[PDB]
């Protein structure tokens, strides 16, 4: 048969995860895309991102260590 019995431990929490346990990234690479403003300004995209709140958005990746802030750039 294909019937299976589950056992549950429910006496106490074994761990506590963050409310932001399921979080997401944007790769540093994306800041090299000429359309970065259009992309992250997307209302459709922001609606989808709001669905996963609360969460961290981590901006990083290999390009983290190949990106330099330039306050003169436009």
């Amino acid at each position: 048969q294909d019937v299976v019995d589950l056992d549950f431990f429910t006496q106490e929490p074994l761990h506590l995860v963050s409310p932001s346990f399921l979080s997401v990234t944007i790769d540093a690479n994306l800041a090299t895309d000429p359309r970065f403003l259009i992309l992250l300004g997307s209302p459709k995209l922001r609606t989808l991102a709001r669905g996963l709140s609360p969460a961290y958005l981590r901006f990083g990746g290999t390009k983290t260590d190949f990106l330099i802030f330039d306050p003169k750039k436009e």
Binding site: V17, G41, A49
Partner: protein, 385 residues
């Protein structure tokens, strides 16, 4: 291969407003390869950014470096873990002098704990561990270029994640006992993902299992590579349409609580039927304090029927079963919840996530190659109140 690029205040603003407008908390990774003559971190560029972000009122958390374990390969510079820890101390001093003096700092964003990485992580934590708020490391199961369909369905592949997690905790417990451990960047497969796999229903076994194990084993936050962008492990495609992993992620967010419990299967093969149990998310308006959320993966090629233990056997259960929309089966980019295709109502509106109430006392049906959440209503679990 890797050349330096610049980014502007505009870019910083685009990123922050995206996070802020979306109710997300931005973590920004700083460039760790800016170095003085004697291999100390040169903080001058980061100081520029910190000042600018301070000036706009941006509440941001920080990292420094990505996979420092492979700096020698990427840029012919070797930074040992001791030095990196000192670099983090110097960043922490800059943050303490800034407008957000309590800003958080995470690192070192090492890869999975192979010998040399584990060594770098240990020496890093000895040196710089006092100043980080959480330890971050990264994980991918496979190279996207070679990964197979079978790999995405293989419990032996899924199980490798367990020893990575144990090894990271071994390092952390030997150096900074109790420091929180985060998966800082993680997905199915690197090289941008496995073509035709990482963006499909089949990707969900790896994603849900990783979440389940991470929660079970003590990882506090898991950061999915990637919400949106290049490759195909994205949650949201090039047309701003959600992929199956987005919908799985949304359901997880809505149903699964912060308090982690345990489930296991009697007879105890514990390979192809994978089960996880948390208290139900109390933010969900449908449910109440005490309720349980079970989630389960069936990697068998036949349906399995799960029986709940006493005292939960006769409770009302709400089923949230995900299956692919045809004709592409597990390689589909569309998913159904309890037989209803998941799709946006419009550009501003997520659809409702409609449960299927089961007959009280019934066994929980889990089709072949599927995953499901089950909310046990009126469970009245004291641990969850």
């Amino acid at each position: 291969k890797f050349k330096n690029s610049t980014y502007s205040r505009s870019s910083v603003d685009v990123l922050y407003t995206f996070a802020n407008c979306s109710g997300l908390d931005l973590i920004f990774g700083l460039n760790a390869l800016l170095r003085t003559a004697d291999l100390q971190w040169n903080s001058s560029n980061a100081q520029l950014l910190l000042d600018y972000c301070s000036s706009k009122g941006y509440n941001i958390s920080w990292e420094l470096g990505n996979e420092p374990n492979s700096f020698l390969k990427k840029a012919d510079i070797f930074i040992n873990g001791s030095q990196l820890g000192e670099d983090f101390i110097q960043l922490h001093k800059l943050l303490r002098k800034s407008t957000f003096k309590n800003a958080k700092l995470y690192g070192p964003d090492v890869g999975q704990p192979r010998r040399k990485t584990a060594k770098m992580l240990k020496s890093f934590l000895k040196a710089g561990g006092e100043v980080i708020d959480s330890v971050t490391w990264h994980h991918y199961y496979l190279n996207g270029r070679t990964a197979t369909r079978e790999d995405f369905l293989n419990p032996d592949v899924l199980d490798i994640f367990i020893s990575s997690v144990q090894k990271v905790f071994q390092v952390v417990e030997s150096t900074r006992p109790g420091k929180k451990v985060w998966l800082g960047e993680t997905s199915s497969a690197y090289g941008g993902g496995a073509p035709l796999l990482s963006d499909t229903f089949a990707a969900g076994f790896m994603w849900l299992d990783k979440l389940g194990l991470s929660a079970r084993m003590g990882i506090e936050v898991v950061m999915r590579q990637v919400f949106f962008g290049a490759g195909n492990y994205h949650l949201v495609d090039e047309n701003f349409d959600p992929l199956p992993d987005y919908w799985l992620s949304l359901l997880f967010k809505k149903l699964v609580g912060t308090k982690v419990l345990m489930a296991s299967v009697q007879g105890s093969k514990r390979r192809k039927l994978r089960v996880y149990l948390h208290c139900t998310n109390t933010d969900n308006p449908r449910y109440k304090e005490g309720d349980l959320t079970l989630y389960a993966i069936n990697l068998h090629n036949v349906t399995k029927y799960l029986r709940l233990p006493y005292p939960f056997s006769n409770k009302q259960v709400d089923k949230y079963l995900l299956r692919p929309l045809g004709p592409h089966g597990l390689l589909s980019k569309s998913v159904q919840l309890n037989g209803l295709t998941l799709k946006m109502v419009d550009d501003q509106t997520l659809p409702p996530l409609m449960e299927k109430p089961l007959r009280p006392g019934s066994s929980l049906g889990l089709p072949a190659f599927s995953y499901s959440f089950f909310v046990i209503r009126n469970a009245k679990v004291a641990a969850c109140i």
